[PDB]
Amino acid sequence: GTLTVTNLLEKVDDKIPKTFQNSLIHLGLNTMKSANICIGRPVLLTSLNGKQEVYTAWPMAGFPGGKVGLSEMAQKNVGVRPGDAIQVQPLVGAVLQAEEMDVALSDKDMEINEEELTGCILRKLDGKIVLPGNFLYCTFYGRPYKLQVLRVKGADGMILGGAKCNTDTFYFISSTTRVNFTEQFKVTYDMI
Amino acid sequence: SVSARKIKDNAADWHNLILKWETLNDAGFTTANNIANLKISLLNKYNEELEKLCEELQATLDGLTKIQVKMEKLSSTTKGICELENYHYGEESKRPPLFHTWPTTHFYEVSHKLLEMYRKELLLKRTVAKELAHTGDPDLTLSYLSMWLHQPYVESDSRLHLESMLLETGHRAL
Amino acid sequence: DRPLLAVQEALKKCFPVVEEQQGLWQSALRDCQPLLSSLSNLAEQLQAAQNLRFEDVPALRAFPDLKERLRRKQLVAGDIVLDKLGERLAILLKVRDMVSSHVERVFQIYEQHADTVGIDAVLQPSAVSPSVADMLEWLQDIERHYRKSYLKRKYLLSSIQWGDLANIQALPKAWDRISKDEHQDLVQDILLNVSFFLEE
């Protein structure tokens, strides 16, 4: 689980969508056979800089042992070079959906309207387990896009702003999650 | 070699049933588009060829009902073999997996959510075949044909889930 | 007679580059047509979905969240078609940049040697060959035609938005209007004029 980081393989086969190529890391068989990591479930990765990122594994062969294969966009999101170390743990805690997520953005993209941005963010990022301090990606109409994730709200009522354990409850982006954004006549019975 | 062979049969029968669902859905869409073109040629300007086209749409729905019956009995025998292993191995037991990693309750939840999605989609297709031949508003005709084509109760990521069993059985090469 | 042979062998290098990039351009536009027909069909279906109400139609009250699921499947099919159109636009931009760099190479090597070779040698046609001035004018016209066509198609593909659907239904007439508006056979006639100079 403490194997060194290398880049993704050049031999890329076609997966089921075009969308889920970003969150699909690459591994060899003895890593899941040794470190007791189930397949088809998200795993949590801790770097040396204190950043935690959660992704989905896919076990093709033709892979060198003793290494973890990550994409270069995930390496730029974590902030590590090929040759660094990382900690891999399976998620043993229970996960469920969320209710509120707020978006931090710079000034130069305030001209995009909020509703179709919210719809495209919810449609492109579905089933993605979110954490604060991470830079998500989506291709708005062929143009790339970057955004920052602040605090989350839970279904049980607990408030996250820390949660570095695999037993901890994490939250995934689905539909019916409301998104906050950061940087008449009236005739009442009074006024008759 | 007994329960694992049932997983070998179950994943392949899952993939074969998805392929016959796609073939029957293409036949149904061609018959429904011909029905709507005959109805708009009727109204812009009989019962024998309209009754014949409705009857082959009914034969397509009967084939989809047979596929759903085989889906329900496959999920029922998967539930039975998971409960058989849970009764046989006892409560307090750390079971090694039959393949490298996965336990069998994950196969039960995968079969349960696939069964729920295709069971809702079949009911929507029965309502479309009920109401297609009588309506007159053309926006609602385009909406009914789009509900046949785009299948809004079948989600995309469940295909990723089917391929998870294809890396738990081994029909695809690792 | 070294600088005139330098200019002539630069032009001999420059023309079969333009033949390969014209073949790439034609294959990209031939791919671009039926995806626009697919977008027109999907915009028609989405306007027919948004036109009516699902709360008053009989035998649809048992399904209480149908419109969002149907709209989600139509929108993800539209995003696939837009990603394929972006790949075709990347092919067109690579063609434009490589053709313009080779044309500026030809004008650079002409501007270096221009004082030793006079106006009289450039202005002289022959029985197999057109003059050097005609070929430089034709290459400049090829570069301007490629840049204008790329920038018009880029602005047309940047005006696609899901809030308005009439311009999405009127996209393929404007895409045919771009090909109808320009000069009809420009690259083929220039290459047919200079082929007797090239195969000598």
Coordinates of C-alpha atoms in Angstrom, one line a residue:
Chain A
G1 CA 0.0 0.0 0.0
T2 CA 3.0 2.3 0.5
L3 CA 4.3 1.8 -3.1
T4 CA 5.9 4.6 -5.1
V5 CA 3.9 6.8 -7.5
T6 CA 4.3 6.5 -11.3
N7 CA 2.4 7.8 -14.3
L8 CA -0.5 6.2 -16.1
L9 CA 0.2 3.6 -18.8
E10 CA 0.3 4.7 -22.5
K11 CA -1.6 1.5 -23.4
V12 CA -5.1 2.9 -22.8
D13 CA -8.1 0.7 -23.6
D14 CA -11.6 2.1 -24.0
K15 CA -13.7 2.1 -20.9
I16 CA -17.5 2.4 -20.7
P17 CA -18.0 6.2 -20.7
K18 CA -15.7 9.0 -21.7
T19 CA -16.5 10.7 -18.3
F20 CA -15.1 8.2 -15.8
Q21 CA -11.5 8.2 -17.1
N22 CA -10.4 10.9 -14.6
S23 CA -11.2 9.0 -11.4
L24 CA -9.9 5.6 -12.5
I25 CA -6.5 4.8 -11.1
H26 CA -4.3 1.9 -12.3
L27 CA -3.1 -1.0 -10.1
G28 CA -1.5 -4.4 -10.3
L29 CA -2.9 -7.7 -8.9
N30 CA -0.5 -8.4 -6.0
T31 CA -1.3 -5.0 -4.4
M32 CA -5.0 -6.0 -3.9
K33 CA -3.9 -9.6 -3.1
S34 CA -1.5 -8.4 -0.4
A35 CA -3.0 -5.2 1.1
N36 CA -6.6 -6.6 1.2
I37 CA -8.2 -4.0 -1.1
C38 CA -11.5 -4.8 -2.7
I39 CA -12.2 -3.8 -6.2
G40 CA -15.0 -1.6 -7.4
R41 CA -14.9 0.5 -4.3
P42 CA -13.3 3.9 -3.6
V43 CA -10.0 4.0 -1.8
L44 CA -8.4 6.9 0.1
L45 CA -4.9 8.2 -0.7
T46 CA -2.9 10.3 1.7
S47 CA 0.2 12.2 0.5
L48 CA 3.1 13.6 2.4
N49 CA 1.8 17.1 2.2
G50 CA -1.4 16.3 4.2
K51 CA -3.8 16.1 1.3
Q52 CA -6.4 13.2 1.1
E53 CA -7.9 12.2 -2.2
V54 CA -10.4 9.4 -2.9
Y55 CA -10.6 7.5 -6.2
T56 CA -11.7 4.2 -7.9
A57 CA -9.4 1.3 -8.8
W58 CA -9.4 -0.8 -12.0
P59 CA -7.2 -4.0 -12.2
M60 CA -5.7 -4.5 -15.6
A61 CA -2.5 -6.5 -16.0
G62 CA 0.7 -5.6 -17.8
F63 CA 1.5 -3.4 -14.8
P64 CA 4.9 -3.2 -12.9
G65 CA 4.7 -4.5 -9.4
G66 CA 5.7 -2.3 -6.4
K67 CA 4.2 0.8 -8.0
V68 CA 0.9 2.7 -8.0
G69 CA -0.2 4.1 -11.4
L70 CA -1.9 7.5 -11.3
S71 CA -3.0 9.9 -14.0
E72 CA -1.0 13.1 -14.4
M73 CA -4.1 15.3 -13.7
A74 CA -4.4 13.4 -10.4
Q75 CA -0.7 14.0 -9.8
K76 CA -1.1 17.7 -10.4
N77 CA -4.2 17.7 -8.1
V78 CA -2.3 16.0 -5.3
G79 CA 1.0 17.8 -6.0
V80 CA 3.6 15.0 -6.2
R81 CA 6.3 14.0 -8.7
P82 CA 6.8 10.4 -10.1
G83 CA 9.0 8.8 -7.4
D84 CA 7.2 10.1 -4.3
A85 CA 5.3 7.9 -1.7
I86 CA 1.6 7.7 -0.9
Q87 CA -0.6 5.8 1.6
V88 CA -3.5 3.7 0.2
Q89 CA -6.4 2.5 2.4
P90 CA -9.8 1.0 1.6
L91 CA -12.9 2.8 2.8
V92 CA -14.4 0.7 5.6
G93 CA -16.7 3.4 6.8
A94 CA -20.3 3.9 5.6
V95 CA -20.9 6.5 2.9
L96 CA -24.1 8.3 1.8
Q97 CA -25.3 11.3 -0.1
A98 CA -25.1 15.0 0.9
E99 CA -27.3 18.0 0.8
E100 CA -25.2 21.2 0.5
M101 CA -22.0 21.9 -1.3
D102 CA -20.6 25.4 -1.9
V103 CA -18.3 26.4 -4.7
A104 CA -15.3 28.7 -4.5
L105 CA -14.4 30.4 -7.8
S106 CA -12.3 33.4 -9.0
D107 CA -13.8 36.6 -10.4
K108 CA -13.2 36.0 -14.2
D109 CA -15.8 33.2 -14.3
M110 CA -18.6 35.1 -12.7
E111 CA -20.1 35.7 -16.1
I112 CA -21.3 32.1 -16.4
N113 CA -24.9 31.8 -15.2
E114 CA -25.3 29.7 -12.0
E115 CA -28.2 27.4 -13.0
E116 CA -26.7 25.7 -16.1
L117 CA -23.3 25.6 -14.4
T118 CA -24.9 23.8 -11.4
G119 CA -26.6 21.4 -13.8
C120 CA -23.4 20.7 -15.8
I121 CA -21.4 20.2 -12.5
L122 CA -24.1 17.8 -11.2
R123 CA -24.3 15.9 -14.5
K124 CA -20.5 15.5 -15.1
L125 CA -19.6 14.8 -11.5
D126 CA -21.9 12.1 -10.4
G127 CA -20.9 9.4 -7.9
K128 CA -17.8 11.4 -6.9
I129 CA -17.0 11.4 -3.2
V130 CA -16.1 15.0 -2.4
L131 CA -13.7 16.5 0.2
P132 CA -12.8 20.1 0.9
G133 CA -9.5 21.4 -0.4
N134 CA -9.7 19.7 -3.8
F135 CA -9.8 20.9 -7.4
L136 CA -12.5 19.2 -9.5
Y137 CA -12.5 19.2 -13.3
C138 CA -15.3 19.3 -15.9
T139 CA -15.3 20.2 -19.6
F140 CA -18.0 23.0 -20.0
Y141 CA -18.8 22.9 -23.8
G142 CA -15.2 21.9 -24.7
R143 CA -13.6 24.5 -22.5
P144 CA -11.9 23.3 -19.3
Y145 CA -12.9 24.5 -15.9
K146 CA -11.5 24.6 -12.3
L147 CA -13.2 25.2 -9.0
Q148 CA -12.5 24.9 -5.3
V149 CA -14.6 22.9 -2.7
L150 CA -15.4 24.3 0.7
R151 CA -17.3 22.7 3.6
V152 CA -20.0 20.0 3.3
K153 CA -23.2 19.1 5.1
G154 CA -24.4 15.7 6.2
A155 CA -27.7 13.8 6.0
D156 CA -27.4 12.9 9.7
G157 CA -26.9 16.6 10.6
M158 CA -23.2 16.6 11.4
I159 CA -21.2 19.5 10.0
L160 CA -17.8 19.2 8.4
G161 CA -15.6 22.3 7.7
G162 CA -9.8 16.2 10.5
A163 CA -11.6 13.2 9.0
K164 CA -8.5 11.2 8.1
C165 CA -9.8 7.7 9.2
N166 CA -11.1 5.0 6.9
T167 CA -14.0 4.4 9.3
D168 CA -15.1 8.0 8.9
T169 CA -18.3 8.9 7.0
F170 CA -17.7 10.5 3.6
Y171 CA -20.2 12.1 1.2
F172 CA -20.8 11.7 -2.5
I173 CA -22.3 14.1 -5.1
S174 CA -25.7 13.0 -6.4
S175 CA -28.8 14.7 -7.7
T176 CA -30.9 16.6 -5.1
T177 CA -27.8 18.2 -3.7
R178 CA -28.2 22.0 -3.5
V179 CA -25.1 24.1 -4.4
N180 CA -24.2 27.3 -2.8
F181 CA -21.8 29.8 -4.4
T182 CA -19.1 32.0 -2.9
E183 CA -16.4 34.2 -4.2
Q184 CA -43.8 43.7 -6.6
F185 CA -47.3 43.9 -5.1
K186 CA -46.9 42.4 -1.5
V187 CA -50.3 43.6 -0.2
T188 CA -50.0 42.5 3.5
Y189 CA -52.6 43.1 6.2
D190 CA -50.3 45.8 7.7
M191 CA -50.5 48.3 4.8
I192 CA -54.2 48.4 4.1
Chain B
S1 CA -16.2 -25.2 -7.5
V2 CA -20.0 -25.3 -7.0
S3 CA -20.9 -21.7 -5.9
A4 CA -18.1 -20.2 -8.0
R5 CA -19.5 -22.0 -11.0
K6 CA -22.9 -20.4 -10.2
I7 CA -21.2 -17.0 -10.3
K8 CA -19.6 -18.1 -13.7
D9 CA -23.1 -18.9 -15.0
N10 CA -24.7 -15.8 -13.5
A11 CA -22.4 -13.2 -15.0
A12 CA -22.6 -14.7 -18.5
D13 CA -26.4 -15.0 -18.3
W14 CA -26.6 -11.3 -17.1
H15 CA -24.5 -10.2 -20.2
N16 CA -26.6 -12.3 -22.6
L17 CA -29.9 -11.0 -21.2
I18 CA -28.7 -7.4 -21.6
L19 CA -27.9 -8.2 -25.3
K20 CA -31.4 -9.6 -26.0
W21 CA -33.0 -6.6 -24.2
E22 CA -31.2 -4.3 -26.6
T23 CA -32.3 -6.3 -29.7
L24 CA -35.9 -6.3 -28.6
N25 CA -35.8 -2.6 -27.8
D26 CA -34.6 -1.8 -31.4
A27 CA -37.4 -3.9 -32.8
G28 CA -40.0 -2.1 -30.6
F29 CA -38.7 1.3 -31.6
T30 CA -39.0 0.5 -35.3
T31 CA -42.6 -0.8 -34.8
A32 CA -43.6 2.3 -32.7
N33 CA -42.1 4.8 -35.2
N34 CA -44.1 3.1 -38.0
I35 CA -47.3 3.2 -35.8
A36 CA -46.9 7.0 -35.2
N37 CA -46.2 7.6 -38.9
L38 CA -49.4 5.6 -39.8
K39 CA -51.4 7.6 -37.3
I40 CA -50.2 11.0 -38.6
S41 CA -50.9 9.8 -42.1
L42 CA -54.4 8.8 -41.0
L43 CA -55.1 12.1 -39.2
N44 CA -53.6 14.3 -41.9
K45 CA -55.7 12.7 -44.7
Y46 CA -57.3 0.9 -41.7
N47 CA -57.8 -1.2 -38.6
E48 CA -56.2 -4.4 -40.0
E49 CA -52.6 -3.2 -40.4
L50 CA -52.9 -0.9 -37.3
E51 CA -54.1 -4.0 -35.3
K52 CA -51.3 -6.0 -36.8
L53 CA -48.6 -3.4 -35.8
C54 CA -50.1 -3.2 -32.3
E55 CA -50.0 -7.0 -32.1
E56 CA -46.3 -7.3 -33.0
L57 CA -45.6 -4.6 -30.4
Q58 CA -47.5 -6.8 -27.9
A59 CA -45.3 -9.8 -29.0
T60 CA -42.2 -7.6 -28.3
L61 CA -43.6 -6.8 -24.8
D62 CA -44.2 -10.5 -24.1
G63 CA -40.6 -11.3 -25.0
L64 CA -39.4 -8.5 -22.6
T65 CA -41.7 -10.0 -19.9
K66 CA -40.0 -13.4 -20.4
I67 CA -36.6 -11.8 -20.0
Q68 CA -37.8 -10.1 -16.7
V69 CA -39.0 -13.5 -15.4
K70 CA -35.5 -15.0 -16.0
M71 CA -34.0 -12.0 -14.3
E72 CA -36.1 -12.4 -11.2
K73 CA -35.4 -16.1 -10.9
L74 CA -31.6 -15.5 -11.3
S75 CA -31.6 -12.9 -8.6
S76 CA -33.7 -15.3 -6.4
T77 CA -31.2 -18.1 -6.8
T78 CA -28.4 -15.7 -6.1
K79 CA -30.2 -14.6 -2.9
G80 CA -30.6 -18.3 -2.1
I81 CA -27.0 -19.2 -2.5
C82 CA -25.8 -16.2 -0.4
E83 CA -28.2 -17.2 2.4
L84 CA -27.1 -20.8 2.0
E85 CA -23.4 -19.8 2.5
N86 CA -24.4 -17.4 5.4
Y87 CA -26.3 -20.2 7.1
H88 CA -23.5 -22.8 6.5
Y89 CA -20.5 -20.7 7.5
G90 CA -22.1 -19.5 10.7
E91 CA -22.2 -16.0 12.1
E92 CA -18.7 -15.4 13.6
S93 CA -16.5 -16.5 10.8
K94 CA -13.9 -14.6 8.7
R95 CA -14.7 -16.0 5.3
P96 CA -12.0 -16.0 2.6
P97 CA -13.4 -14.9 -0.8
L98 CA -14.2 -17.3 -3.6
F99 CA -12.4 -15.1 -6.1
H100 CA -9.5 -12.8 -4.8
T101 CA -11.4 -10.1 -3.0
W102 CA -15.2 -9.9 -3.1
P103 CA -17.7 -11.3 -0.7
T104 CA -21.1 -12.6 -2.1
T105 CA -23.3 -9.9 -0.5
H106 CA -21.9 -7.4 -3.1
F107 CA -23.2 -9.7 -5.8
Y108 CA -26.6 -9.7 -4.0
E109 CA -26.8 -5.8 -4.0
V110 CA -25.6 -5.6 -7.6
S111 CA -28.3 -8.1 -8.7
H112 CA -30.9 -6.3 -6.6
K113 CA -30.4 -2.8 -8.0
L114 CA -30.2 -4.1 -11.6
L115 CA -33.5 -6.0 -11.1
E116 CA -35.1 -2.9 -9.6
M117 CA -34.0 -0.6 -12.5
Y118 CA -35.2 -3.0 -15.3
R119 CA -38.5 -3.7 -13.4
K120 CA -39.3 0.0 -13.4
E121 CA -38.3 0.4 -17.1
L122 CA -40.6 -2.4 -18.2
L123 CA -43.6 -0.8 -16.5
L124 CA -42.9 2.5 -18.3
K125 CA -42.8 0.6 -21.6
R126 CA -46.2 -1.0 -20.9
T127 CA -47.7 2.5 -20.3
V128 CA -46.2 3.7 -23.6
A129 CA -47.6 0.8 -25.5
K130 CA -51.0 1.5 -23.8
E131 CA -51.2 5.2 -24.6
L132 CA -49.3 5.4 -28.0
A133 CA -52.1 4.6 -30.5
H134 CA -54.8 7.0 -29.2
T135 CA -53.1 10.3 -28.5
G136 CA -53.3 13.3 -30.9
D137 CA -51.0 16.0 -29.5
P138 CA -47.7 15.6 -31.5
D139 CA -45.5 16.9 -28.7
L140 CA -46.7 14.0 -26.5
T141 CA -46.1 11.6 -29.4
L142 CA -42.4 12.8 -29.6
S143 CA -42.2 12.5 -25.8
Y144 CA -43.5 8.9 -25.9
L145 CA -41.1 7.9 -28.7
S146 CA -38.2 9.5 -26.7
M147 CA -39.3 7.5 -23.6
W148 CA -39.0 4.4 -25.7
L149 CA -35.6 5.3 -27.1
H150 CA -33.6 6.8 -24.2
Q151 CA -34.8 4.6 -21.3
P152 CA -34.8 7.0 -18.3
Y153 CA -35.0 4.3 -15.6
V154 CA -31.8 2.5 -16.7
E155 CA -28.7 4.3 -15.4
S156 CA -25.2 4.4 -17.0
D157 CA -22.9 3.5 -14.1
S158 CA -24.6 0.2 -13.6
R159 CA -22.8 -0.9 -16.8
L160 CA -19.6 -0.2 -14.8
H161 CA -21.1 -2.4 -12.2
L162 CA -21.7 -5.2 -14.7
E163 CA -18.1 -5.0 -15.7
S164 CA -17.1 -5.4 -12.0
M165 CA -18.6 -8.9 -12.2
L166 CA -16.7 -9.3 -15.5
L167 CA -13.5 -8.8 -13.4
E168 CA -14.9 -11.1 -10.7
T169 CA -15.7 -14.0 -13.1
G170 CA -13.0 -13.6 -15.7
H171 CA -14.6 -13.8 -19.1
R172 CA -12.7 -10.6 -20.0
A173 CA -8.9 -11.0 -19.9
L174 CA -7.1 -9.3 -17.1
Chain C
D1 CA 22.0 31.0 -60.6
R2 CA 22.0 29.8 -56.9
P3 CA 19.3 32.1 -55.3
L4 CA 16.7 31.4 -58.0
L5 CA 17.2 27.7 -57.6
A6 CA 16.9 28.2 -53.8
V7 CA 13.5 29.9 -54.2
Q8 CA 12.4 27.2 -56.7
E9 CA 13.4 24.3 -54.5
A10 CA 11.6 25.9 -51.5
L11 CA 8.4 26.2 -53.6
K12 CA 8.9 22.5 -54.7
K13 CA 9.0 21.6 -51.0
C14 CA 6.1 23.7 -50.1
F15 CA 3.3 22.5 -52.4
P16 CA 3.0 18.7 -51.5
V17 CA 2.6 19.7 -47.8
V18 CA -0.6 21.6 -48.9
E19 CA -1.8 18.5 -50.7
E20 CA -1.7 16.3 -47.5
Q21 CA -3.3 19.0 -45.3
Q22 CA -6.1 19.6 -47.8
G23 CA -6.9 15.8 -47.6
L24 CA -7.0 16.0 -43.8
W25 CA -9.4 19.1 -44.0
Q26 CA -11.8 17.4 -46.4
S27 CA -12.0 14.2 -44.2
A28 CA -12.7 16.4 -41.1
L29 CA -15.6 18.3 -42.7
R30 CA -17.1 15.1 -44.1
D31 CA -17.0 13.7 -40.5
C32 CA -18.6 17.0 -39.3
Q33 CA -21.9 16.8 -41.2
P34 CA -24.0 13.9 -39.5
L35 CA -23.2 14.9 -35.9
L36 CA -24.9 18.2 -36.6
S37 CA -27.9 16.3 -37.9
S38 CA -27.8 14.3 -34.6
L39 CA -27.8 17.6 -32.6
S40 CA -30.8 18.9 -34.6
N41 CA -32.8 15.8 -33.8
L42 CA -31.9 15.9 -30.1
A43 CA -32.8 19.7 -29.8
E44 CA -36.2 18.9 -31.4
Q45 CA -36.9 16.2 -28.8
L46 CA -35.8 18.5 -26.0
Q47 CA -38.2 21.3 -27.1
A48 CA -41.0 18.8 -27.4
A49 CA -40.2 17.6 -23.8
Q50 CA -40.1 21.2 -22.4
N51 CA -43.3 22.3 -24.3
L52 CA -45.9 20.3 -22.3
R53 CA -46.8 19.6 -18.6
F54 CA -46.5 16.2 -17.0
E55 CA -48.9 17.0 -14.1
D56 CA -52.2 17.0 -16.1
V57 CA -51.6 14.1 -18.6
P58 CA -53.5 10.9 -17.6
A59 CA -51.6 7.7 -16.8
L60 CA -48.4 9.5 -15.9
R61 CA -49.2 10.4 -12.3
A62 CA -47.7 7.1 -11.1
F63 CA -44.2 8.3 -12.2
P64 CA -43.4 11.4 -10.1
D65 CA -39.8 12.3 -11.3
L66 CA -39.9 11.4 -15.0
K67 CA -38.9 14.8 -16.6
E68 CA -35.6 15.1 -14.9
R69 CA -34.4 11.6 -15.8
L70 CA -35.5 12.0 -19.4
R71 CA -33.8 15.4 -19.6
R72 CA -30.6 13.9 -18.1
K73 CA -30.3 11.2 -20.7
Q74 CA -30.9 13.7 -23.6
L75 CA -28.3 16.1 -22.2
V76 CA -25.6 13.5 -21.7
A77 CA -26.1 12.4 -25.4
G78 CA -25.7 16.0 -26.4
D79 CA -22.5 16.3 -24.4
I80 CA -21.0 13.3 -26.3
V81 CA -21.8 14.9 -29.7
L82 CA -20.2 18.2 -28.6
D83 CA -17.0 16.4 -27.5
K84 CA -16.7 14.7 -31.0
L85 CA -17.1 18.1 -32.7
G86 CA -14.3 19.6 -30.5
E87 CA -12.0 16.8 -31.7
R88 CA -12.7 17.7 -35.3
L89 CA -12.0 21.4 -34.6
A90 CA -8.6 20.4 -33.1
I91 CA -7.7 18.6 -36.4
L92 CA -8.6 21.8 -38.3
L93 CA -6.5 24.1 -36.1
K94 CA -3.4 21.8 -36.5
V95 CA -3.9 22.0 -40.3
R96 CA -4.0 25.8 -40.3
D97 CA -0.9 26.3 -38.1
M98 CA 1.3 23.9 -40.1
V99 CA 0.3 25.5 -43.5
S100 CA 0.9 29.0 -42.2
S101 CA 4.4 28.1 -40.9
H102 CA 5.5 26.6 -44.2
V103 CA 4.3 29.7 -46.1
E104 CA 6.3 32.0 -43.8
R105 CA 9.3 29.8 -44.4
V106 CA 8.9 30.4 -48.2
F107 CA 8.6 34.2 -47.8
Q108 CA 11.6 34.3 -45.4
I109 CA 13.9 32.6 -47.9
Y110 CA 12.5 34.9 -50.7
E111 CA 13.2 38.1 -48.6
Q112 CA 16.8 37.0 -47.8
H113 CA 17.8 36.6 -51.5
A114 CA 15.6 39.3 -53.0
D115 CA 18.3 41.8 -54.0
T116 CA 20.5 39.6 -56.2
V117 CA 17.6 38.3 -58.3
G118 CA 15.9 41.1 -60.1
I119 CA 12.3 41.9 -60.9
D120 CA 12.9 40.6 -64.5
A121 CA 13.7 37.1 -63.4
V122 CA 10.6 36.8 -61.2
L123 CA 8.3 38.3 -63.8
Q124 CA 9.2 35.7 -66.6
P125 CA 6.8 32.8 -67.5
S126 CA 7.7 29.8 -69.5
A127 CA 6.2 27.0 -71.5
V128 CA 6.0 24.5 -68.5
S129 CA 6.2 26.9 -65.6
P130 CA 4.3 29.9 -64.2
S131 CA 6.2 32.8 -62.8
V132 CA 7.4 33.0 -59.2
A133 CA 5.1 36.0 -58.5
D134 CA 2.0 34.0 -59.4
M135 CA 3.0 31.2 -57.1
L136 CA 3.7 33.5 -54.2
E137 CA 0.3 35.2 -54.7
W138 CA -1.4 31.8 -54.9
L139 CA 0.2 30.6 -51.6
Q140 CA -0.8 33.8 -49.9
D141 CA -4.4 33.3 -51.0
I142 CA -4.3 29.7 -49.7
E143 CA -3.2 30.9 -46.2
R144 CA -5.9 33.6 -46.0
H145 CA -8.6 31.1 -47.2
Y146 CA -7.7 28.6 -44.4
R147 CA -7.6 31.2 -41.7
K148 CA -11.0 32.8 -42.6
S149 CA -12.7 29.4 -42.8
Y150 CA -11.3 28.2 -39.4
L151 CA -12.3 31.4 -37.6
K152 CA -15.9 31.3 -39.0
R153 CA -16.4 27.7 -38.0
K154 CA -14.9 28.4 -34.5
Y155 CA -17.4 31.2 -33.8
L156 CA -20.3 29.1 -35.0
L157 CA -19.3 26.2 -32.7
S158 CA -18.8 28.7 -29.8
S159 CA -22.4 30.0 -30.1
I160 CA -24.0 26.7 -28.9
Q161 CA -26.0 26.9 -25.7
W162 CA -28.8 24.8 -24.3
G163 CA -31.0 27.8 -23.3
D164 CA -31.9 28.6 -26.9
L165 CA -32.8 25.8 -29.3
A166 CA -33.7 27.5 -32.6
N167 CA -30.1 28.3 -33.4
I168 CA -29.3 24.6 -32.6
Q169 CA -31.9 23.7 -35.2
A170 CA -30.5 26.2 -37.7
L171 CA -26.8 25.1 -37.3
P172 CA -26.6 22.8 -40.5
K173 CA -27.9 25.5 -42.9
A174 CA -25.2 27.9 -41.6
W175 CA -22.6 25.1 -41.8
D176 CA -23.6 24.6 -45.5
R177 CA -23.7 28.4 -46.0
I178 CA -20.0 28.7 -45.0
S179 CA -19.0 26.1 -47.7
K180 CA -21.3 27.7 -50.3
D181 CA -20.0 31.3 -49.6
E182 CA -16.3 30.9 -50.2
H183 CA -14.3 30.4 -53.4
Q184 CA -15.3 27.0 -54.9
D185 CA -12.2 25.1 -56.0
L186 CA -9.1 27.0 -55.0
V187 CA -6.5 24.5 -53.9
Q188 CA -7.2 22.0 -56.7
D189 CA -6.8 24.5 -59.5
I190 CA -3.6 25.9 -58.2
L191 CA -2.1 22.4 -57.8
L192 CA -3.3 21.5 -61.4
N193 CA -1.5 24.7 -62.7
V194 CA 1.7 23.9 -60.9
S195 CA 1.8 20.1 -61.4
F196 CA 3.8 20.4 -64.7
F197 CA 6.4 22.4 -62.8
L198 CA 6.5 19.9 -60.0
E199 CA 6.9 16.7 -62.1
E200 CA 9.7 18.1 -64.2

